[PDB]
Design a protein around this nucleic acid. Structure first.
Lengths: 96, 79, 127, 98, 114, 150
RNA sequence: GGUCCGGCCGGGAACUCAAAGGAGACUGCCAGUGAUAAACUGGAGGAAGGUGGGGAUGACGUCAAGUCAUCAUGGCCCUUACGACCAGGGCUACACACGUGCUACAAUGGCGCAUACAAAGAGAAGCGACCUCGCGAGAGCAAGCGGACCUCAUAAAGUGCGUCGUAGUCCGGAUUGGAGUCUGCAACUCGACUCCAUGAAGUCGGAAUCGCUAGUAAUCGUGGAUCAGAAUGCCACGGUG
RNA sequence: CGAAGAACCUUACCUGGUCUUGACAUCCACGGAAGUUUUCAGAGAUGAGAAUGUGCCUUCGGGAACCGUGAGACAGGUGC
């Protein structure tokens, strides 16, 4: 699971519009609970692998996923350099 | 209970039941995606579950409508 | 012409003006007894003006931005201390002799790591 | 009330820049504002330059990063135009955008 | 309204009579006292059946006790078994909701003992 | 510890000018909330006054006379074993201690509401019957007596 | 100054605010203290007082204690391997405790209708009002809002008028009858919450593990990240007291 | 506890399905234009088909974006 599923996401991540979120702009309106066409949704759900919103992600500045801090764009282990180059602008003397 | 607004199924299972359903005096079925809700026309024959420890048959008799096959899969000796 | 004051206590965030004569105490649009009607602290907000005979000589008008009546009851104290300090230099002695001149600034060398009081140094009668 | 949010790394540079507008964008129209500050980023700065891993060598600096509102009450071209002609003074980030 | 049931309120006033009935919505009891509508102080016998026959056709299609204590058990049947939704867990004679609620069933079904 | 910084100064009460009534309800608090508890203790001095229809505040001292102590006993082992040795509580500790004995009876004491516990318990104090008088008198039956064993 | 009753929009610079450059309190002068040393007390005068407070730096010396799970690297690893791809699942049982953390034992309580005031925060892998359909978890419409404009607090206390009458209830959510949901391959033998029926221990427990001295523990709340996400962990400042 | 989410989860482990230059990344050898859309299989990895496409320098040389198969060198892990 180190470099891993990167090879599978990279080939279908960029088309999440074409798979759904712009292909939806006529047929998906009826297809909702608010609009009741029961026949329809069940025959757009087939792409399974691309099926957004799902992205395994790419932490880049760490070669492997030792977690990923979404508030900060870095791995779960990575904090200490930001006292030595300023990438977390409130990283100062601890609150404890 | 979290089947939150309508039905669903184990896909890979009910896609392959079709030749057991054809003339159902035929021997049992199996599954491992224990997630397994099933459908009304499996009736009068025997699905089964990897439990996980071993396998166990569960008999679709006359009345089925209501819960996942997880309702009969003995997963550790419950004392 | 007129005088002024402002305060910061618990957590008001209030001001006061003084006007020439007739002796009242309003809060924007209602009188004192309407804004503090059961708050046991209501008595102090006029008390060093009534001394120097306010009834025909001074008059008072409070406004507010953090209501907070249990702090406001003293935020007004340092505020009205300011107002008086330009009307009469003589009352600096009064305001001081009765405490009205003070404002909130003092902890007593308290807890930082775990020892209750933490400034007072290790101490003997010869060691 | 269109808010031109002037900023620089230093106080010296943003001073020179606002002082041109409060006079020249004021010429025939608005009482144009400019000294009126924001949460000015007076913090402390630490980058490693240790020539090996040994004691400290993370030389701590200080900053100003000073910021103000220029405010124009109407877009009135016959008064504002000098601030748009001031484009050549690249070092001050102006954030006109509203 | 001569409503179906097992019990009657005894001497208590409206707001407590109406909810000591053996299965009538206490959160509802507030609006329904104004629905009829009657005072908070009525010791229910002064309604002479007829100052409540006034909501009759509504209460003729509500669950009042005799159903909630019995006949509601016939309402589960089309959900009740193995298959999809709600479940066999009702037929099997267990606690329905709690953490691991199958495991609770010592007293319920046979064991008692730990 | 060398500095004279020790005790709590507070202001007096809102009606009659005493630190007594202020400190009294400023023990009775049991959960903070001060202002309404000061209003209940005012109602306590009125429900005392209903016993006569005069200035019964003149009897608040008269009662507290039977409830102010002299002694307190503190943690003392100075002759190799338990050795008390009371020594007196100072002139200002006299009625401040009596509040604690009035409050620790009041908490559960059974009367008709929060004021009517303190009104009746200060009635009892006046008549020497008080729970607070008995709590005082027990440390007088104990400590003030061991003055002849010290 | 106009009011068509909203700082509404005219209208001007007292002060909060926002805030940059910065600035002012010293035994200063008054009494007592003693050696007119000492310094310790009250006070002129004060926004602190004898570090004024709160953060902070945390030298050698630091237990032969760590960070040995980002450390930075010298001596040394396994390498048919401790190397890397990918679907399943099961950790929670239950006798045992024992505690950490939760509470329930009713009037210095709440319960029902009605009334007076703060904010600490986080915020385009964003946060979203008014406004439509509502028993409500939860649907929809969408103004807005990038850093006092949008929004999430309309803290809980307290106060005025009613109702129980000390009563296992009216309070106990232990929980179990049915009903539903926001996502998901995914929660069921695995959750997380909602609507109505209810109601397991309940009535003040002993011994003996340390909380907590001050603006500090009872008391009185709100936020945050990890992360396709539900921590009771912890973490930080406000305030009746 | 590390775990701030031991039911896709940064995988222990119980396994089964692939491998041991492996997922990732080079230096030369012969060659390629890069990708969009479903249908049937499969538990995932991966398997069997059907259609639609053809870019920039342009010495027509050498290649880019960018995909290949074949060489010799050659890859890694919280192990305290």
């Amino acid at each position: 699971a180190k470099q891993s599923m990167k090879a599978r996401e990279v080939k279908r991540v960029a088309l999440a519009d074409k798979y759904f979120a712009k292909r939806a702009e006529l047929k998906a309106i009826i297809s909702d609970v608010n609009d009741r066409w029961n026949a329809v949704l069940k025959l757009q759900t087939l792409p399974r692998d691309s099926s957004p919103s799902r992205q395994r992600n790419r932490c880049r500045q760490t070669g492997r996923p030792h977690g990923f801090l979404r508030k900060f764009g870095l791995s779960r282990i990575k904090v200490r350099e930001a006292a030595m180059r300023g990438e977390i602008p409130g990283l100062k003397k601890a609150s404890w | 209970r979290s089947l939150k607004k309508g039905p669903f199924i184990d896909l890979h299972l009910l896609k392959k039941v079709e030749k057991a359903v054809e003339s159902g005096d035929k021997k049992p079925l199996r599954t491992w995606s224990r997630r397994s809700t099933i459908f009304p026309n499996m009736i009068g024959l025997t699905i089964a579950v990897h439990n996980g420890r071993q396998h166990v048959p569960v008999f679709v008799t006359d009345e089925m409508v209501g819960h996942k096959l997880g309702e009969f899969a003995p997963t550790r000796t419950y004392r | 012409n007129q005088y002024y004051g402002t305060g910061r206590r618990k957590s008001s965030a209030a001001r006061v003006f003084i006007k020439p004569g007739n002796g009242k105490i309003v809060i924007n649009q209602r009188s004192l007894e309407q804004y503090f009607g059961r708050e046991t602290a209501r008595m102090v907000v006029r008390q060093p003006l009534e001394l120097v005979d306010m009834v025909e000589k001074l008059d008072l008008y409070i406004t507010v931005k953090g209501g907070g009546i249990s702090g406001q009851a003293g935020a007004i104290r340092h505020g009205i201390t300011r107002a008086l300090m330009e009307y009469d230099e003589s009352l600096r002695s009064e305001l001081r002799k009765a405490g009205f001149v003070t404002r909130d600034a003092r902890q007593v060398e308290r807890k930082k790591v775990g020892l209750r009081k933490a400034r007072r140094r290790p101490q003997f009668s010869k060691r | 009330r269109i808010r031109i949010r002037l900023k620089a790394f230093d106080h010296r540079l943003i001073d020179q820049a606002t002082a041109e507008i409060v006079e020249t964008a004021k010429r025939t129209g608005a009482q144009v504002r400019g000294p009126i500050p924001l949460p000015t980023r007076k913090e402390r700065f630490t980058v490693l330059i240790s020539p090996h891993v040994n004691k400290d060598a993370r030389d701590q600096y200080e900053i100003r990063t000073h910021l103000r509102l220029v405010d124009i009450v109407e877009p009135t071209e016959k008064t504002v135009d000098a601030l748009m002609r001031l484009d050549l003074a690249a070092g001050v980030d102006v954030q006109i955008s509203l | 309204a001569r409503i179906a049931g097992i019990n009657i309120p005894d001497h208590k006033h409206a707001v407590i009579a109406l909810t000591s009935i053996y299965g009538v919505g206490k959160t509802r009891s507030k609006a329904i006292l104004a629905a009829a509508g009657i005072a908070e102080d009525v010791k229910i016998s002064e309604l002479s059946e007829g100052q409540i026959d006034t909501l009759r056709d509504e209460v003729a299609k509500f669950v009042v006790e005799g159903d909630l204590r019995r006949e509601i058990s016939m309402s589960i049947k089309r959900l009740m078994d193995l298959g999809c939704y709600r479940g066999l867990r009702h037929r099997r004679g267990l606690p329905v909701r709690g953490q691991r609620t199958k495991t609770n069933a010592r007293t319920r079904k046979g064991p008692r003992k730990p | 510890r060398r500095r004279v910084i020790g005790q709590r100064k507070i202001l007096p009460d809102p009606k009659f000018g005493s630190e007594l009534l202020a400190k009294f309800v400023n023990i009775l608090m049991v959960d903070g909330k001060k202002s309404t508890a000061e209003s209940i203790v005012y109602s306590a001095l009125e429900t005392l006054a209903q016993r006569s229809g005069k200035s019964e505040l003149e009897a608040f001292e008269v009662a507290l006379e039977n409830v102010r102590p002299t002694v307190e006993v503190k943690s003392r082992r100075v002759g190799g074993s338990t050795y008390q040795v009371p020594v007196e509580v100072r002139p200002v500790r006299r009625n401040a201690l009596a509040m604690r004995w009035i409050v620790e009876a009041a908490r559960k004491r059974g009367d008709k509401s929060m004021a009517l516990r303190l009104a009746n318990e200060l009635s009892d104090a006046a008549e020497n019957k008080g729970t607070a008088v008995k709590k005082r008198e027990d440390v007088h039956r104990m400590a003030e007596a061991n003055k002849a064993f010290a």
